[PDB]
From a paper:
Therefore, we chose to crystallise the hARH3 E41A substrate complexes as this prevents substrate cleavage during crystal formation, while retaining a functionally relevant magnesium coordination. Our structural data further reveal that in the α-NAD+ complex Glu41 would be displaced from the axial MgII position by the nicotinamide moiety, thus forcing the observed open conformation. Within the hARH3:α-NAD+ complex, the interaction between nicotinamide and MgII is sterically dominated by the binding of the ADPr moiety within the active site. The positive charge at the N1 nitrogen and long MgII-ring atom distances (3.4–4.1 Å) suggest that the arene cannot act like a chelant to displace MgII from the protein coordination. However, the nicotinamide moiety sterically prevents occupation of the axial ligand position of MgII, thus creating a free valence at the Mg2+ ion and forcing the Glu41-flap to open. In addition, the nicotinamide positioning is distinctly asymmetric, reminiscent of ring slippage, which may polarise the π electron system and weaken the N-glycosidic bond. Noteworthy, neither the H2BS7mar nor the α-NAD+ complex have a water ligand at MgII, thus excluding the ion as a water activator during the reaction cycle. The relative distance between magnesium ion and nicotinamide in our structure suggests that rather than engaging in metal coordination, the ligand displacement leads to a free valence and a high energy magnesium state. Together with slippage-like positioning of the nicotinamide ring, which introduced polarisation into the π electron system, it likely provides the energy for bond cleavage.
Author numbering: 18 to 60, 70 to 361
Write the structure that this text describes.
Amino acid sequence: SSLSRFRGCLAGALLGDCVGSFYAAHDTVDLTSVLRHVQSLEPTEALYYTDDTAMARALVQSLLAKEAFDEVDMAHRFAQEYKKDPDRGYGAGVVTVFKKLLNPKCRDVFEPARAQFNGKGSYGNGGAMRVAGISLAYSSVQDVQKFARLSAQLTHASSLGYNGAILQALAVHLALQGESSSEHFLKQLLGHMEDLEGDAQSVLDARELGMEERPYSSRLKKIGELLDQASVTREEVVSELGNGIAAFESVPTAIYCFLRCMEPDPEIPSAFNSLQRTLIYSISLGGDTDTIATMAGAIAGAYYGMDQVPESWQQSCEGYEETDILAQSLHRVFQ
Ligand SMILES: NC(=O)c1ccc[n+]([C@H]2O[C@H](COP(=O)([O-])OP(=O)(O)OC[C@H]3O[C@@H](n4cnc5c(N)ncnc54)[C@H](O)[C@@H]3O)[C@@H](O)[C@H]2O)c1
Ligand SMILES: [Mg+2]
Ligand SMILES: [Mg+2]
């Protein structure tokens, strides 16, 4: 059901953040060691969430409070959540946005993000790490892109930053539509990114800024190559897609993890379901594990639904009940 997919999406995102952060802090990022310690996930709420979930919650609470996108409300919810708990693991640059939004003199909630990094904007993955709720609030693809972009621009004004958020939101949107081949899923995403990155003002800006042409489209094409490739190794995935804090080096990677893990992996025991396998695999890539896993888990959770959210894993996660209530509320309000 759509309710099951809404609940699965937000639970999967929470699992990716909580389980990913557990392994990141224990310096356990290779597959054998992840599998060795799955018992630590208790197969009380022992796994803390990070800034990924803190911002995801604030984004969803803003949409529910206004039953619409309100940039002032959402920006203030982000800044107030930072002020309440600044120690969740926020990016070093984005804290400047929050501090500016907390200034009473601030008159334009989008200006701080535009001023980041000498006026070029952040390219980090923070706009995408929190975006899944957009695709629960907005069922139409045009609205998904519109509000993924706007919500990301509150902190991430560069096209790499906000187009990464759009791509992640589109992947969650597509996953909510149910069963698909990997090929069809990837082709749909590629078609949307080609439209967005082929736009005249966009490819001109990529020219004057020295960037490469159609960056996300190129990486989605690389994903299709990897999905057809024999004996793909972690080193090839990381070398070709990245595992970094930049949206460009993490959003495609998360999507690859979802697509690859739609099929069994001989290196991951078959006792794990498809959502679990996706999370385990994503964490084994290392790098920015909490954000790659939160994004892969949001897509996988929307796709597989609550039936694949293991109670023992879910109940180990800080705030899993509030996360589930928010998912059900989004369904009641917007569906
Ligand atoms: N293991 C990790 O990498 C790790 C662990 C905890 C938290 N984080 C945090 O870092 C990631 C990104 O967060 P965010 O995008 O909200 O924070 P952000 O401050 O907007 O960007 C994060 C970092 O990327 C760099 N950066 C981004 N844009 C530019 C630019 N235009 N020029 C030069 N450098 C730039 C810079 O080092 C900045 O601090 C998230 O995963 C967040 O959780 C990362
Ligand atoms: Mg984090
Ligand atoms: Mg992170």
